[PDB]
Amino acid sequence: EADEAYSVTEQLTMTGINRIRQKINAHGIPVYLCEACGNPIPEARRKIFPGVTLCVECQAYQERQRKHYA
Amino acid sequence: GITKASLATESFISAASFQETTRVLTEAAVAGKRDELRGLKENVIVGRLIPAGTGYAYHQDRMRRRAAG
Amino acid sequence: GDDEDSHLGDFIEDTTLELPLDSATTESLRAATHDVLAGLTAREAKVLRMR
Amino acid sequence: VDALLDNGRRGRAITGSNKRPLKSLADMIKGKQGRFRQNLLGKRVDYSGRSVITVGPYLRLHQCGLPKKMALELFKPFIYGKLELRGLATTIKAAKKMVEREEAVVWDILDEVIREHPVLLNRAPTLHRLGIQAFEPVLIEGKAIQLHPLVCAAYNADFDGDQMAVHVPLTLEAQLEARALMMSTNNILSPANGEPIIVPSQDVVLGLYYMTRDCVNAKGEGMVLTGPKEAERLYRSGLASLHARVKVRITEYEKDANGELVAKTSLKDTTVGRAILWMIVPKGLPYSIVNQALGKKAISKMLNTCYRILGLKPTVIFADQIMYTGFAYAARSGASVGIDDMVIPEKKHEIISEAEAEVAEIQEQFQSGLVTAGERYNKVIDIWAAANDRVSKAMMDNLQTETVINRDGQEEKQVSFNSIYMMADSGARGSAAQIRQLAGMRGLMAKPDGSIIETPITANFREGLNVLQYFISTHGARKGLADTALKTANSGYLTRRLVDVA
Amino acid sequence: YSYTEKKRIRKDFGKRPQVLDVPYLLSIQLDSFQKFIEQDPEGQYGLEAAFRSVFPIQSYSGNSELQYVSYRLGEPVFDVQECQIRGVTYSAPLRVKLRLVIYEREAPEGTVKDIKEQEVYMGEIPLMTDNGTFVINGTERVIVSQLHRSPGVFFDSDKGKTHSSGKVLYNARIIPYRGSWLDFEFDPKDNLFVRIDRRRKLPATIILRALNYTTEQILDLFFEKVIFEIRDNKLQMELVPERLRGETASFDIEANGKVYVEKGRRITARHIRQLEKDDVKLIEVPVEYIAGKVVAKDYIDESTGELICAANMELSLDLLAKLSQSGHKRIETLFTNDLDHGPYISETLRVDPTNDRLSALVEIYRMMRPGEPPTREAAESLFENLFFSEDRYDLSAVGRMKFNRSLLREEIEGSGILSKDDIIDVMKKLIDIRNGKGEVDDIDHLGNRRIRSVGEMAENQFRVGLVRVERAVKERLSLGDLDTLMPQDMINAKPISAAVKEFFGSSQLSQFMDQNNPLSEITHKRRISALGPGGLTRERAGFEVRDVHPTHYGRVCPIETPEGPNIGLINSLSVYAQTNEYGFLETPYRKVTDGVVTDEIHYLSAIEEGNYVIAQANSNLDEEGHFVEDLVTCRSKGESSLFSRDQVDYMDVSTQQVVSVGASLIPFLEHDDANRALMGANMQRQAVPTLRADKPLVGTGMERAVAVDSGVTAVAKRGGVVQYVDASRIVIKVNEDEMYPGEAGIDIYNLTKYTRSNQNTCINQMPCVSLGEPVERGDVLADGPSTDLGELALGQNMRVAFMPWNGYNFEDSILVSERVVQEDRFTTIHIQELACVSRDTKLGPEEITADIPNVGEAALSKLDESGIVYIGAEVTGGDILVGKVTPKGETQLTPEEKLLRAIFGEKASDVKDSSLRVPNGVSGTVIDVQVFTRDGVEKDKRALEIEEMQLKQAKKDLSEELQILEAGLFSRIRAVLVAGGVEAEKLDKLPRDRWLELGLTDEEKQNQLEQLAEQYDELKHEFEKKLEAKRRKITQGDDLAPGVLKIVKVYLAVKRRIQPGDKMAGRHGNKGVISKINPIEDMPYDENGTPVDIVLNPLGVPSRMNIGQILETHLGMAAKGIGDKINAMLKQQQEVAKLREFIQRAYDLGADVRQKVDLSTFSDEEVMRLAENLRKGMPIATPVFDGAKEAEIKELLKLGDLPTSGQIRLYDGRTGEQFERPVTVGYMYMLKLNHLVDDKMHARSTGSYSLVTQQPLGGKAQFGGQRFGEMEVWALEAYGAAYTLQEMLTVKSDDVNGRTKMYKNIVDGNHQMEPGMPESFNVLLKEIRSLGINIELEDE
Ligand SMILES: [Mg+2]
Ligand SMILES: [Zn+2]
């Protein structure tokens, strides 16, 4: 008893973090043209995030838009 | 769905256990409904042998005595 | 208390009932009296059963 | 009339001088839910009782410890009967006075009426049919019920003060029903999944593990013994170590014939511990099954195969021996736990400063607009989330094998014998997951929201936590308790709907 | 260092200095009540406050006014002790001065006469104890402080789940302190609605019409005006250069001889910069833009005088022409923009069924009370009473403050009710948030949760007490004759005293004090609840409010909360927390000015705290008090991060201030998983007080604060020396400095001796000082139960060792050595109260006579001639405590009984046996008997002996006071007579009573002798009256209930040892139920032979991540080590030198701590007494987050000469051989909780049965059998257990006929059942058949 309550918490925490973690993937490699609007992707985003397809401008914008509807 | 499936039961005594009791009896009293027991819930209600397990022997042996001569 | 479906009437005990330990001994008091009156003389039984 | 029949389908006639509305005929049948009388609970019931439960490892699996005081009051009509049957009482009214007087003569009578008379033990939320089980009663001085430890799994009983109820099978039918259907030993397999539910729990498995385990070099190294009988002789007298590599003559059996027992004798390469253990295992099992290390996992598959090969009877008495022995050697082992058992990795502070600089990289990039704001959150959360996997599998490499010890020649390393490891590796309690919060850092926590916080708990339990770290740990902890409090109501409702439809 | 510190000093680890010592822990309860009952010559909350609101009361305009003067509190009818035994409530009579004035008819006002009626009595109001409890019926109760939503206005969401569109919604709520709710809410269509209370939703604009606002003023108020000019022919428009933002051009928009923008180009920053800078006031337009515009005011035709267009009517290209040809130059229109200023209020008007003032006032009246007709006088009055009456509505000051606060006003106080402006301004602000400017509140933030406590809640219950008497007073003042009735005739007592008795008696917030433990009491009085009146409900909210909120830091404990159906719905008050002036929760901090940390402290409410940047508790500052590092971990606006040295505005006071008193009592808390910590401070309060008050070897430092601040201990009023020490009382001869000038004398503390608690535990005080010892003010004078030497000792620590012991600790079960039960040390003393009642039944009166039918002298030995058990008689189960008989005549016995009576000659009595007998299984010593007798029934024999003995004891007690107080007072007279006439030997020869005569030469010493005389004769007379009243109270008729003649209460002292079944646990959430009690022969011992007391399971420690219990065990081990060292040296009698050298080394340890110590203590007489108190072990202190660290523990293990491992080798006491591996041994403070087995254990063969349902029922405490509910039936259904089930709900319970048929069969030795039908179902058939339903049993 009670021990299970702790157990429950750990499983939940792990799952939430994991989803978040995945949303970054891993060893990617590609081009530099933004898929939304073609703006220049700097090699900084290429080397920070392996497989980036959204310019910094679009990597805000969309994030921003989602927030607004919340 | 399980909740909907269970809602339909042959024994009216069983229904007045878990369904809304006022409605069950009213709906059932006008119909002149006859409950033959047969099920588990109702036999527990009326306090006789469960028609399964050890009692299955008895209920089976007695159910056949019915509709007979 | 508790607001629970525990109601006053659910605690009112029955006082007219006869508890088995007494219903037991009464069934057994007849037994003893009966055997005591047969182990007597047949006249003393009819005499005592009558008084 | 309407207020009499079903009050409430009007304006709600109230009772005299009393604000509350008066309960009508319809309100006398209806309830929550339906007829109160058939709803839990459920009707109180004569011949019953309860108290706190305690242990009693000395029990056979088919019995239980029942207080003298309770058994006296419970079987009262039986005692009154057997007392006047054998002639010790003139009449029932005398028998009443005798057991009331607690005359010593009665105790010897009670033991007669108790013998082949099962009682029913039932613990709090009755979830499966194993929630009620029938035991043979053993008289106890004390006011607690003694509950055989292997049944604790089925009841989901721990001993934090839980109480159980007793029920006396009155009628002759109820005794034979309780003996052939509800008896402990008749229900050792879960009806949900054919696997044994009477698996050895925790103390008892940690026992066998330490026993059938080997270290590189200890007393008894390499000698050879006539059979299991003299392997114990070697150990009990302190000549051999429990865990030392040893060839001994063993005789295993295999009923591989047409239902017929074949015997095989061999000089098996084993340890003293595993030798002694074979003395329990019944006939037709192979010596291979006890030749391993025996964790909680391997220990239950053993019980399973015993059932599916020899049958109910041999498995039951076997399962008793497993418990008895595991407890005994667990005590001999002297396993314990002190502060120095929870070994932190030597690299911890390093791993932090590295992933701490990783946030300093992604920070520089955020301020300079290389990466966006929501991006940076999910970036930092990964470089912390990684370091925790590094700290976890660092200590676990250190903790697992780093007992480095030597045999006659140079150096060698093996699975650790550190106390807290043996517990997890065996399966007695705790897992590398929970261990990760004792030695390594304990994760990142998240507030009830779910949005995991961007500065993890960098400290662990062997160290202190500080003000903030504990306060962050709070949220996850409280919602944990809060959740499982409601998760009690939810289980109950699902199973209820299912039996209504079945 | 003090006096009861010099006795025994706890070695304190922990580096951070205490800057503010823990205030009175009962501050909250005592403070609040003191405010309620007190003369306040102004409005601040109190009884004065409540009065001033309702008063003055005036008759129905008859100019007969009753005004309120002032009030007094009579002395308590019984004092604390007195009121408890008898069973009265501890209350004082409330006497309030009232003035009745009458105005002539007809009067320019002024009075014919006014009678100034003295203080009419309106009930007694309960009083709070010295220690923060109430007495309601001789039973101590606590009033739990409550947490509810602050009054004011709060804008909330209801995002997401609403409608499954997302969108979100926004609603405003005006929540006043008293009066109806005012709710404003939107919907998806963006229509504003209002609902009073939780009632029927209604279109929002209706309230404006109720305030006498017509359609024109609603447009004017909530909208701007777009002025349309007809200049020349067809339409110009006033253009605000800003209006066009968030819209696209509607036409060819041109002005100033230049086309700025053509049709179809959205008006942005370019166009608005042009218009504003070029000053475009007027532009020419087409007649079609007003096709959508809404006309503002009313415009009528000047000729025909008819209505052209009503206000809030949309124009059309044809509608303009009708009011253009009539000569109307202006047409005012609405500015409608769905991003900035939305056309919201416009749409609402179109949904309103009303039009004028009385039109709306009706729709409000018909909504509130449907079904009955509206009236002109009714509808107008109703609305004015809702939000505008001083009587039926009030926000209070706090409500007005948060109201003004949330609305960005300046005034912090203003109207107490809502105004036409107030309501409008709120509707205004609500709209702003929907527009995107502004954010919503959350219920959870502790700046929007307010704390009420006893003082306030009683005020409110008194206010309602008057409003139901006010109707009555107004009613009498209508018809009241001239100068005959006076302000007492009208005001009844019961109506006032009932409205207040209602609260303290039964309320979710008035409960039996959780009193098994000084921690239990103190943790209860500091408690919060969001449940009950005016708060949330368990079924309502809703996880957000249960969860721990960031604002809880330092106000509410994060860890101490119940573990049940209301988690987070209770919480416990943090240590240093205090209630804001406005009634919010604030906490202490330290003012960081620039880069220095000051010691001037500030209390910051939840709202105040958010703004500032607060440093952390554990922060290193040195020298002047600069921050050591250039960056320090701090928390500011809801989050926590690293901060610059000089940006921090404040800093945490203590490392402790985040937890509760319960939570702070856990040592090495930092090392304990938060969940288990909760269980720890949850179970700590369940610790039953022990026989011998131990002391925690492993402590935290708080134990002294909890012991003292909880009443259980006896704390010195004034410093001085002890004159007399008795196990009964303690007399303190006061020092001169603290001693008052007159009455002189001594402080005399009468001790509480063995007595029943609320939970049947025993609460007993013992003297902790010896004859003639120096004590200073605020010293510990006597220990309560579970307190030692001034420290809080909820249990007894013992030698504990972690290892499997043959399975006798399988789950969390505990294995205990016999040495513990032999040492009677977890033995626990309980006091039950059993009472006997002589009633009146229809057949006759019950007698308490000792003549009991068919009982032998064996019984009547323990009973006196009167029929009451003697004091002091050790009795067990079955012995009769009070003989009693009830009238039951003519039994009508049967033949065989008759024959039996004739054979053995028993005079079959006409009286039943009803005597009070001892419950089976429980056994103890009688320590007290009370008899309460009806006024006017003759006190029997024993009753008269008692009330005679109470008299002799009371006379001895009072005189003892006078004897000590005289001698104490005469002793001062002797010393002042010596100052200017000292005749040392001459003076004390003559009789001391013959001293008062000696005078003194011209000086104040002549006036000083005069002072002691006054207070002597007052002791002489105050003695007399104190003795007189005492005597009357004993003989006076004890008043009882109807039907009851006299009552005997017997008090038992059962001494329960400890046996398998008892729940025990350490402070770290490690529960366990003692499983077997082992012989000392079988215990694990070490090479020195000393067995170990408890054998715990190592498996319980890793899973439940409570690692502090191990640190406790190790430190405890080292703490006993220092003990074992001193015990040897003290037995060696080494001498002060060798001893003091060793003690000094312990209290430093490594360097950097906060402790400080000797050699100041007087190097002999004082130092030796300490050594003694330490030989049992050296008390150490691990503060909560300032705790000891492994190194300090290992270092203290070195000094104790014990291994650093914390582990040793052990030997099995049975086989004698070694245990492989080292095992940990040490000392862990452990509690025995009061789930003691021989309270839980019940059994029943055949017992009582309920009347209504022939069903096993608890009646004589041979309790009802176990309930066999639905789930237990499915159990039997899953087996084949068909018969086991039938018997379970037939003969074993419900079958009135079957149960006896069975029992008879059982004793005949035939196991069968002849079942038949359960009466439960038999009643259903009749219950159904008594409805119109023919329910039969068919066939055969
Ligand atoms: Mg439990
Ligand atoms: Zn882009």
CSV table of N, CA, C and O and ligand atoms in Angstrom, one decimal, chain A residues 1, chain D residues 158 160 162, ligand 1:
chain,number,residue,atom,x,y,z
A,1,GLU,N,0.8,-1.2,0.0
A,1,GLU,CA,0.0,0.0,0.0
A,1,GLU,C,0.9,1.2,0.0
A,1,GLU,O,2.0,1.2,0.5
D,158,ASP,N,-0.8,-6.3,2.8
D,158,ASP,CA,0.5,-6.0,3.5
D,158,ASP,C,0.1,-6.1,5.0
D,158,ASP,O,-1.0,-6.4,5.4
D,160,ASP,N,0.5,-3.4,7.4
D,160,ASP,CA,0.5,-2.0,8.0
D,160,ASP,C,-0.6,-1.8,9.0
D,160,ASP,O,-1.0,-0.7,9.3
D,162,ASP,N,-3.7,-4.0,8.6
D,162,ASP,CA,-4.9,-4.4,7.9
D,162,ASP,C,-5.6,-5.5,8.8
D,162,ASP,O,-5.0,-6.2,9.5
F,1,MG,MG,-2.4,-2.2,4.5
